[PDB]
Amino acid sequence: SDQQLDCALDLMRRLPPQQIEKNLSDLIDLVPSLCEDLLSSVDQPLKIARDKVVGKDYLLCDYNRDGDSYRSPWSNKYDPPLEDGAMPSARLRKLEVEANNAFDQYRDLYFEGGVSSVYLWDLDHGFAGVILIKKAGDGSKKIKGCWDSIHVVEVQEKSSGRTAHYKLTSTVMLWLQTNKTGSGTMNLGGSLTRQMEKDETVSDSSPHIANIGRLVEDMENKIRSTLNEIYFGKTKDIVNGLR
Amino acid sequence: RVSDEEKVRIAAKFITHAPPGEFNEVFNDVRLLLNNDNLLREGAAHAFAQYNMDQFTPVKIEGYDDQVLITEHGDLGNGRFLDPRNKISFKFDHLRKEASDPQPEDTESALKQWRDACDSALRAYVKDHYPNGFCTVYGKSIDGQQTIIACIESHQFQPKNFWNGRWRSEWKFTITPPTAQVAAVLKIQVHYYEDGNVQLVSHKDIQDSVQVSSDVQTAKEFIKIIENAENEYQTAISENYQTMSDTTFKALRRQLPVTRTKIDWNKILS
Amino acid sequence: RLEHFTKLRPKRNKKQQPT
């Protein structure tokens, strides 16, 4: 069923992204045996939930889900409450708290608003994490805009702890909708995904969060520029090539 | 879990939602996913025909100039379609996208002259305004009202560059001399899929009225209304691209922090 | 034909699948 997963992911690259959530739900109904693999590999728009303990929003996706509950990066608890859901190790949780604080500052500097969340998980010889950012324009503008960043980092640690190998797979979803007299309904939406890997020294002057921060920042800046080119350049030139 | 009849409904839905120029890829994906070739043939037969009629698929009939569009307006039943310009029906193979077996056909003649005048005017309009556009004009009585239905298609398929696009417009002129009521919808779909999936889906509805006289002078007024509205829509789309880019998009994320340099990650962690 | 980068993202193991 590598073949089936490849076909399902190809379909998600082709079906209109305006229906990205219904596309995934329909796919899971079509091939229920793929459910777990699809929830892992098919990115979805980020949803917001309230951590009632801290009065702060956090982001939901498959990477903080267990059963039908989601874990807050602020409280480290599942909602609704769960017995024995997947949890980062004690030491990884400390890194996760530190990463959440670093990425909230990153989010403020670049997005001047929105919501961020970071979720880490242990691997056999390292760890992995997702850094999530959601920013929506005012939905009262009938000129709707939303940005989702999904950055998944795998960190393979080496015995010394003086170097690590980082693999970053980043998706940005960008959604724009307008309903105007001249241009009628225009919905321009979807996502781009890119991947890169690097070895970096790990030290007190360059700890994991700094190494990950730089990779994320470099990738997101690059993707922002590519979105600009594709959305407002390429798709526009194509429209004008049709008539 | 999920019934076979539901699975093939979903399969049929996906097949009909293939972006322009990517029907075969979606179809092959859906086939492997359903993994039940005999189920797919039964429950998703309609899907191929539905896709072709929805997308205004242009087809060449050997021996006749230009191309005809496959549309709901031309569906004669039993796999045959009308070519109202050449006054023939033909068999259309929805899998191979091929026309065969042309046969004389006439449908209604209250509007023969008006349909021909409109067809002639629209053909020139489409060739002038679209790089490789096609049109088909139908004349039919709908609820006792004589109606000219003009369909226009233009696509550009560049899958090796990971993009495809299609324009469709459908214009209805309900002729009640000396007035014609105008109703139209203009539609655009563009897909870009190099390392992603980005789509523009756009449509605009048009309503208008025009005072009518003779067939030829009226056809002329119809094409003037079409031209103004389609030019207006294209202009507005490009203006909206500009507004989206320097308002909404810029507001979602800065290029850089106010410092005009990348982040000092050491200040961050302190 | 298309490359699917998300296939190679590290799996996170859950305790419970969705219900």
Numbering used by the authors:
A (entry chain B): 2 to 244
B (entry chain A): 7 to 276
C (entry chain C): 985 to 1003
What did the study's authors say about this model?
Since the CP-binding motif of the CARMIL proteins is sufficient for the interaction with CP, peptides derived from this motif were used for the crystallographic studies; mouse CARMIL (residues 985–1005; referred to as CA21), human CD2AP (485–507; CD23), and human CKIP-1 (148–70; CK23) (we collectively refer to these synthetic peptides derived from CARMIL proteins as CARMIL peptides). Each elongated peptide binds along a continuous curved groove on the surface of the CP β-subunit. The consensus motif interacts with CP across the two domains: the N-terminus with the CP-L domain and the C-terminus with the CP-S domain. The conformations of CP within the CP/CARMIL peptide complexes are similar to each other (RMSDs; 0.71–0.90 Å) and are slightly different from either CPfull or CPβΔC (RMSDs; 0.97–1.26 Å), suggesting that, unlike V-1, the CARMIL peptides do not cause a large conformational change to CP. In contrast to these two peptides, CA21 does not contact CP via the C-terminal flanking region. Moreover, unlike CD2AP, the CARMIL residues immediately C-terminal to the motif do not contribute to the stable CP interaction, consistent with our structure in which CA21 does not contact CP in this region. CD23 and CK23 moderately inhibited barbed end capping by CP, while CA21 was a poor inhibitor. Surprisingly, CD23 and CK23, which possess substantial affinity for CP, strongly inhibited the CP/V-1 interaction, indicating that the peptides restrict the conformation of CP to the “low affinity to V-1” form. This inhibition depends on the CP/CARMIL peptide interaction because CA21, which has a lower CP binding affinity than the other peptides, exhibited minimal inhibition. A superposition of the crystal structures of the CP/CARMIL peptide complexes onto the EM model of the CP/actin filament structure clearly revealed that none of the peptides on CP overlap with the barbed end actin protomers.
The actin capping protein (CP) specifically binds to the barbed end of actin filaments with a high affinity and prevents the addition and loss of the monomers at this dynamic end. CP is a heterodimeric protein composed of α- and β-subunits and the molecule displays a pseudo two-fold symmetry due to the resemblance of the tertiary structures between the two subunits. CP caps the filament with its two independent actin binding sites at the C-terminus of each subunit (“tentacles”). V-1 and CARMIL proteins directly bind to CP and inhibit the filament capping activity of CP.
